[PDB]
Design a protein around this ligand. Structure first.
Ligand code: HEM
Length: 402
């Protein structure tokens, strides 16, 4: 199912990469995407998969396109072109600036600094519950429960609401069929709306209270705007963190030498986090052309979609030498893992703290662990690439109890 080549697209630029099922997937998802950076592949290519779209394959072009919001609009940020209404995903500057500022009040650095110890306590509780078992599926047993619990903390929501909320967010990205995306989204709004209304009347210092009482265009934020922002604050931090933590733990389970480095020098963990963010980058979003535009010698047409994979910038050998090698001592770790330009991840500070806290606590309590005997780790590819499951094993006698 290749879409017919639009007549403005020259055949020599055609490379039929399928972002949802890349051909090299069993070799690892980052490796599968990195085929776009082989020397026979232009900086900018067209694929006929998934409706047909451009792909920028190099960090220079990926960065430039994210900077040039006048040409590359977020109005349609996903491939393929086909109910999504979260804020401020689909907004271009200048509409976007006010909403970002508000979201920044609830997940910005000062909030992350205040929450850090709570995040650690949560990580500790999860790890301690798994420690004596000598095994887990890390993706399911630690990664999945962790970010949703951090959201409940950030948003001041009771833990009793977790199973239902997690179900709704799971339906938006991995539907079992019980709910369409639109139904899942509306159920999420059914949940958030009463809470937003109550906290407009009786505010706390939690994220929902702050969003609900925010100001837009010199007037109060509307309930519709508030639910759409809260929805994004919820979903934006789930699959990205789950899968990223899984890539990192897979690598650490498989590379005892890198693991030992962090055991011996825990102070290097924040730098290691940055290098892992580069090597195991996982997002691939896009933009839509606002007008006909010649970009690096290539004629783009108004309405063309362009995939601008955040994942690829840091894997580009032009940005980082020997880019598939993990080296926690890199003097310059170049990446766009959290994006670039006006939509740069608002959760980047929270995410890094989640990653660093997880690694610190896991290496403290369970320093020696491996991939389960016999297991082969499977990746998945898409807008957020990921790990299907991560069976880990360890000897409880080598662990340190709480
Ligand atoms: C490893 C973890 C994460 C990664 C790799 C990541 C990646 C990204 C990227 C690449 C973007 C820009 C998308 C684009 O330009 O189309 C983005 C935006 C965003 N992220 Fe994250 N994210 C992570 C964690 C989080 C967390 C923990 C939160 C919230 C608690 C969050 C909330 C958001 C929001 C609200 C936006 C939209 C910003 C805007 O449009 O102005 N993210 N994220």
């Amino acid at each position: 199912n290749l879409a017919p080549l639009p007549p403005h697209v020259p055949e020599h630029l055609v490379f039929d990469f399928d972002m949802y099922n890349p051909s090299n997937l069993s070799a690892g998802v980052q490796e599968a995407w990195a085929v776009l950076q082989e020397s026979n592949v232009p900086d900018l290519v067209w694929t006929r998969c998934n409706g047909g779209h451009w792909i920028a394959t190099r960090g220079q072009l990926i960065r430039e396109a994210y900077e040039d919001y006048r040409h590359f609009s977020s109005e349609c940020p996903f491939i393929p072109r086909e109910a999504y209404d979260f804020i401020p995903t689909s907004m271009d500057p200048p509409e976007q600036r006010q909403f970002r500022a508000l979201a920044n009040q609830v997940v910005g650095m000062p909030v992350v600094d205040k929450l850090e110890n709570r995040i650690q306590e949560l990580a500790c509780s999860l790890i301690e519950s798994l420690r004596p078992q000598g095994q887990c599926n890390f993706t399911e047993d630690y990664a999945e429960p962790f970010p949703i619990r951090i959201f409940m903390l950030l948003a001041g929501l009771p833990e009793e609401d977790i199973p239902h909320l997690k179900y709704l967010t799971d339906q938006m990205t991995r539907p079992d069929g019980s709910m369409t995306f639109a139904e899942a989204k509306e159920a999420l709004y059914d949940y958030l709306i009463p809470i937003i209304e109550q906290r407009r009347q009786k505010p706390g210092t939690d994220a929902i209270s702050i969003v609900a009482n925010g100001q837009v265009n010199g007037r109060p934020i509307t309930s519709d705007e508030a639910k759409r922002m809260c929805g994004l604050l919820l979903v934006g931090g789930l699959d990205t963190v789950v899968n990223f933590l899984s890539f990192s733990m897979e690598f650490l389970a498989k590379s005892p030498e890198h693991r030992q480095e962090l055991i011996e020098r825990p102070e290097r963990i924040p730098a290691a986090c940055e290098e892992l963010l580069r090597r195991f980058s996982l997002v691939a979003d896009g933009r839509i052309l606002t007008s006909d535009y010649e970009f690096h010698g290539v004629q783009l047409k108004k309405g063309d979609q362009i995939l601008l994979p955040q994942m690829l910038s840091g894997l580009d050998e032009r940005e980082n030498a020997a880019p598939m090698h993990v080296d926690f001592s890199r003097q310059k770790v170049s990446h766009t893992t959290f994006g670039h330009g006006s939509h740069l991840c608002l959760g980047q500070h929270l995410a890094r703290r989640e990653i660093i806290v997880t690694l610190k606590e896991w290496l403290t309590r369970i320093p020696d662990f491996s991939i389960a005997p016999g297991a082969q780790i499977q990746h998945k590819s898409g807008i957020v690439s990921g790990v299907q499951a991560l069976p880990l094993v360890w000897d409880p006698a080598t662990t340190k109890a709480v």
